[PDB]
Nucleic acid binder design. Structure first.
Lengths: 187, 49, 124, 147, 49, 34, 52, 225, 104
RNA sequence: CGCGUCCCCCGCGAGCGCACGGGGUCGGCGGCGAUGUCGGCUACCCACCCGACCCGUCUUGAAACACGGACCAAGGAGUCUAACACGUGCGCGAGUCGGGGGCUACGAAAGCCGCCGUGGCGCAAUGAAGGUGAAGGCCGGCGCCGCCGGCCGAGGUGGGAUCCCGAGGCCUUCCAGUCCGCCGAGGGCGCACCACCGGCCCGUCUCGCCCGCCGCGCCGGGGAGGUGGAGCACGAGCGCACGUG
RNA sequence: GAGUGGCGCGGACGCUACGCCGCGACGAGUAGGAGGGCCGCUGCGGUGAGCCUUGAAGCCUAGGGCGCGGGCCCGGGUGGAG
């Protein structure tokens, strides 16, 4: 008889990806090895991110990689994205970048390689830098999804600016009793 | 497009690029070790005091 | 490559046979006859086979050549060894170590060859 | 896949994951959106504020084609016209501005969200925002109206 | 041929795995001609299987 | 890899004709059993 | 009865809808029929434009 | 040509051997100095007591620094305030023992659990057999048996506790690094008392086993250890 | 069909399972509820920090210039202590090298 | 417990072998064996000791003097559709999708269309509505001017996985002295995200001047400061599949 | 760690990396949730140069066993076409 609570003794994180795609599952084998063998904490973070869901590794736009590599003391450095690199159409000038991504969108490939850029895969990144030296590891915005507007404090509960789940937006779809001083009360 | 272009991670992992930038393999296996007493086992006592 | 087409074959190949909590591979060049990355005999560039002879007597050693690997009819180069046990086992040891040819199948090939030579020996 | 579903794992139990005390009865709160002002008031207030009551003017024979006004921001204005035009305008000495017919690409009103790259434009739009016009002028451009 | 053999296709005698034959094969009208071709390509043990 | 080898064409008698096709890039596409 | 935050939603399934469920197993048979009747029309007007 | 590698790899092998012997001698001499200290500590408490009696005065010895708290009641039907303190003392199981240093903050935590514990003022020999027989170190959050000194030198060596004797000295003579050396010990998994308890429920003073047994915890440690 | 009216019996046990969370006391609390006439002025005080940027930035160099001259014009037993010195790897390399040479 | 050297008090010796030493071995044996004997744990029957009330169910509480069940076989109860939400897998990605239509035995399939993306959903919100509809600063031409131009130009603080620099240092009878690698005082750029502070858009309110002009008007536009918004602030969506509610 | 200076042709095992190995602590459970089943039923696409009138399915079984269990595999009898 020991007074332990077993409620939280099982840690609920990912040991492996849920996916059965082999090319990712070979990149995991490569970073299973590099993570635990190299002293680099970079490889630990890349391995950890190869497990994560589509939603946990959101797409990083070309323009954020433009922006986040314009930052000082970051010149001649490889931009590592464990998610995907999407083209941003509201950016005109694109510099020469060194990029690692699982996916680069065909319009963003064209855009980066035309600007004298180089595109790597995680297999090349290992051979280029096994310990992940000379890298800027970036992530897309994870509160990017519309899903996160519906989350937090329930709408109809004062100072909650939480999007309600409404069938269709208009002038007679949840605008009256809980929304106005005129139609009863306002939160 | 390919997610990785060199699938052969025999040749990747044993490339000098990577083999340089590892720590040494800890291949020595450590089984449990039996407790012996103070007043019972004389040379187990001599190993500690 | 080998590591890729292992990830296809590992579970859903025709040669794969699961039953009685055991896993086997009935591939024509697997020496330990077991579903394993190392022992699979279709997937590597270098492959050692050991089968009994076309006759009753001797062992055939199947070396897979370096070059034409999309070329099945010329890819496997077979050599019958019909000698005494000690020299049949020696030839296989020399083939594998002193050509450096898949040298981590050196002992599996010998143990297999030894068990083929035992098989084609008259019963008491 | 019926085999992946929860019902398969609940063979051999009794209540079928629906409670031994509070049975799985048919419609024990009423059907559909029943009792939104009575016994479900807190759900319709905590989660659907505004659901009950009239607000605004009725418009009987509303025709969505009349109010059709697809809007383009300045930040994506140069996507309407090929990247060749953006290049050749900056090279060419004349000071000649390429024409961006916003109506051809399938937008009517030009709104002024982003930075516009510093070269002259003639935006042929149907409507303009004030800030949208100021940016086009500010870069050194014209705002042509059309119908 | 690793994956094609793992699908169980008897292709040991087969000259090349992306086996490509002449455009004369389109003009074949009798099965006697078709059967004869597979004996020569050595795809026939796949039919015999 | 990237490379596309030189693929021979076999005659009706099951022997290599002089003609070659460059392996199409389809045959070097990613294998996804998924 | 509403569980928590979910969409307020009104299915139109209160009428005897199962009597009037139109299925589309015809679809490929319809398309074959329309295409045969289009080829048959086009052959009747030998020189004339098939479209009309 | 290897003759230099062969010779160099043997010098490294030898440099670690002479380094062991030097550590092995330190550990030997530290324990010999500790034997001299425990003599002087034990002998002065007699010496001080005697000269006080010669004068006709009294020598009130120091209130003790170090208790050995054993849990005597089980896991069932325990008040929340008692539950919390017993798991701050790392007594999460019946007949678990921990060393606890006495101060004002500790003694009010030992009256709050009085019914559920049996504690006292452990002897030197009580600290020996507990650390030797029952001594398990908490190394990488794992209960690993103190079978070599280098288990204790790798966790506690930064506090200059580099052998079994250094730990025993740090516990018994409640040193500057008592906290770290005591938290290093796993709570002692003691067996049921051989010959029995008197009465689990009631306090020791009223013929029970619960509460403070000043000299007398050592009678029950030797029974349970 | 009378029933139990009110109790608080199991509740204190329920509260303490997921702890009784003290509020996430984050740094820089919001200026909600601070009096409008004061919050107006503080916003103006932030608005015109650009004005005294040169007066501030040059004054940082003059504090550094005082420090530019302020670093410029600035410049238990005998056996156990001896055996602890010989025992540990760095400081006792030469002490141990002589023990190895002492037995020649 | 050599001594070559250092001053107060006066860097590798070779063997062997024993073992309270990182979990048991014997280089010890002895009986028996063809028509009565050996082994076979489980299973068939029987005996004895201990334990042992009848299941399902509603219930605070069932062995209940609560209900259902004589016995056996076979049948027999969370489904399918639609919608929605979230999670997960896959494709493409500021897009995405032909699903309707059309074109060309298995095939009622599959393949294709792109001047078939009509269209959906996303890319813009906000107001009941008319509608409106998402950074600026600085330096000059006339200590402050309506507008002339000039150039850099999409915030700030704090915490932030990672990376970046590297004071110092990790050994061969020495000591210089590189190249390669590695650790590291201290110093930075800081992803996502969180909190805070600014800003912007829309509604509305307050104060308050100043521009505009084919029609000078009950016209139009702008400012400052609060405030309502399911917003902006270098996109994530769409399609498909699966799970759960 | 590296560069310029003062005879005998030999060596167990492994690594279905969705695998294998090591060390520590732990194990009640209704309603309920989740996971894994080389648990079982019936049909479909693949696949096993599978099995089968020299005896399939089904059934019976004081037989030999395997698995924590769901179950399963063997022997013997019956049966006759999968």
């Amino acid at each position: 008889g020991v007074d332990i609570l077993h409620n939280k003794d099982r840690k609920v994180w990912r040991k492996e990806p849920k996916s059965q795609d082999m090319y990712l599952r070979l990149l995991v084998k490569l970073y299973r090895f590099l993570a635990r063998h190299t002293n680099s904490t970079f490889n630990q973070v890349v391995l950890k991110r190869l497990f994560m869901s589509r939603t946990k590794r959101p797409p990083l736009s070309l323009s954020r990689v433009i922006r986040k590599m314009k930052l000082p003391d970051r010149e001649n450095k490889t931009a590592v994205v464990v998610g995907t690199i999407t083209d941003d159409v509201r950016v005109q000038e694109v510099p020469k970048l060194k990029v690692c991504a699982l996916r680069v969108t065909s319009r963003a490939h064209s855009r980066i390689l035309k600007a004298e850029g180089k595109i790597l895969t995680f297999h090349q990144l290992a051979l280029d830098s096994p310990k992940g030296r000379g890298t800027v590891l970036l992530s897309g915005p994870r509160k990017g999804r519309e899903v996160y507007q519906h989350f937090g404090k329930a709408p109809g509960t004062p100072h909650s600016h939480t999007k309600p789940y409404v069938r269709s937006k208009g002038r007679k779809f949840e605008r009256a009793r809980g929304r106005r001083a005129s139609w009863g009360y306002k939160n | 497009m390919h997610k990785m272009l060199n699938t052969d991670l025999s040749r990747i992992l044993k490339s000098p690029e990577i083999q340089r930038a590892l720590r040494a393999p800890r291949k020595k296996i450590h089984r449990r070790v039996l407790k012996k007493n103070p007043l019972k086992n004389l040379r187990i006592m001599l190993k500690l005091n | 490559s080998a590591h890729l087409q292992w990830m296809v074959v590992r579970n859903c190949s025709s040669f794969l046979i699961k039953r009685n909590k055991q896993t086997y591979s009935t591939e024509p060049n697997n020496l330990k006859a077991r579903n394993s990355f190392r022992y699979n005999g279709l997937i590597h560039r270098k492959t050692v086979g050991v089968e009994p002879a076309a006759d009753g007597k001797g062992v055939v050693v199947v070396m897979k050549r370096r070059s034409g690997q999309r070329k099945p009819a010329t890819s496997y180069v077979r050599t019958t060894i019909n000698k005494n046990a000690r020299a049949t086992l020696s030839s296989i040891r020399h083939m594998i170590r002193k050509n450096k040819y898949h040298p981590d199948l050196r002992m599996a090939a010998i143990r297999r060859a030894s068990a083929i030579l035992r098989s084609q020996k008259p019963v008491m | 896949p019926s085999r992946l579903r929860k019902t398969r794992k609940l063979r051999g139990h009794v209540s079928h994951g629906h409670g031994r005390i509070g049975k799985h009865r048919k419609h024990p709160g009423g059907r559909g959106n029943a009792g939104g002002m009575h016994h479900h008031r807190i759900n319709f207030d905590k989660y659907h504020p505004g659901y009950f009551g009239k607000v605004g003017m009725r418009h009987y024979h509303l025709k969505r084609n009349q109010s059709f006004c697809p809007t383009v921001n300045l930040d994506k204005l140069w996507t309407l016209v090929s990247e060749q035009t953006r290049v050749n305008a900056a090279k060419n000495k004349t000071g000649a501005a390429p024409i961006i017919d916003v109506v051809r690409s399938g937008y009517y009103k030009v709104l002024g969200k982003g930075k516009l790259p510093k070269q002259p434009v003639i935006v042929k739009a149907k409507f303009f925002s004030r800030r949208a016009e100021e940016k086009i002028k500010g870069v050194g451009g014209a705002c042509v109206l059309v119908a | 041929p690793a994956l094609v053999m793992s699908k169980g296709h008897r292709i040991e005698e087969v000259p090349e795995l992306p086996l490509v034959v002449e455009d004369k094969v389109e003009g074949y009208k009798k099965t006697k001609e078709a059967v004869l071709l597979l004996k020569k390509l050595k795809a026939w043990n796949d039919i015999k299987k | 890899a990237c490379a596309r080898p030189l693929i021979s064409v076999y005659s009706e008698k099951g022997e290599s004709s002089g003609k070659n096709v460059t392996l199409p890039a389809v045959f070097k596409a990613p294998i996804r059993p998924d | 009865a509403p569980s928590r935050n979910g969409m307020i939603l009104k299915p139109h399934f209160h009428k005897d809808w199962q009597r009037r469920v139109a299925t589309w197993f015809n679809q490929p048979a319809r398309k074959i029929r329309r295409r045969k009747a289009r080829q048959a029309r086009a052959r009747r007007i030998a020189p004339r434009p098939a479209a009309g | 040509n290897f003759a230099e590698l062969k010779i160099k790899r043997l010098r490294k092998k030898f440099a670690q051997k002479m380094l062991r012997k030097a550590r092995r001698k330190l550990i030997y001499e530290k324990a010999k100095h500790y034997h001299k200290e425990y003599r002087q500590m034990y002998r002065t408490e007699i010496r001080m007591a005697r000269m006080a009696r010669k004068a006709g005065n009294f020598y009130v010895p120091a209130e003790p620094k170090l208790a050995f708290v054993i849990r005597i009641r089980g896991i069932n039907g325990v008040s929340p305030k008692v539950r919390k303190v017993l798991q701050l003392l790392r007594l999460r199981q019946i007949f678990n023992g921990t060393f606890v240093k006495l101060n004002k903050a500790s003694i009010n935590m030992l009256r709050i659990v009085e019914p559920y514990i049996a504690w006292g003022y452990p002897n030197l020999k009580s600290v020996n057999e507990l650390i030797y027989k029952r001594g398990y170190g908490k190394i990488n959050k794992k209960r690993i048996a103190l079978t070599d000194n280098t288990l204790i030198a790798r966790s506690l060596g930064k506090y200059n506790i580099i052998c079994m004797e250094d730990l025993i000295h740090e516990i018994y003579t409640v040193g500057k690094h008592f906290k770290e050396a005591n938290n290093f010990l796993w709570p002692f998994k003691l067996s049921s008392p051989r010959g029995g308890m008197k009465k689990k429920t009631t306090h020791f003073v009223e013929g029970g086993d619960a509460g403070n047994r000043e000299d007398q915890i050592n009678r029950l440690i030797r029974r349970m250890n | 069909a009378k029933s139990k009216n009110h109790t608080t019996h199991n509740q204190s046990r329920k509260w303490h399972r997921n702890g009784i969370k003290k509020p996430r006391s984050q740094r820089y609390e919001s200026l909600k509820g601070v009096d409008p006439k004061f919050l107006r002025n503080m916003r103006f005080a932030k608005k015109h920090n650009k004005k005294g940027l040169k007066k501030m930035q040059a004054n940082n160099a003059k504090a550094m210039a005082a420090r530019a001259e302020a670093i410029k014009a600035l410049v238990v037993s005998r056996k156990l202590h001896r055996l602890a010195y010989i025992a540990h790897p760095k400081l006792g390399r030469r002490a141990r090298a002589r023990i190895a040479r002492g037995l020649r």
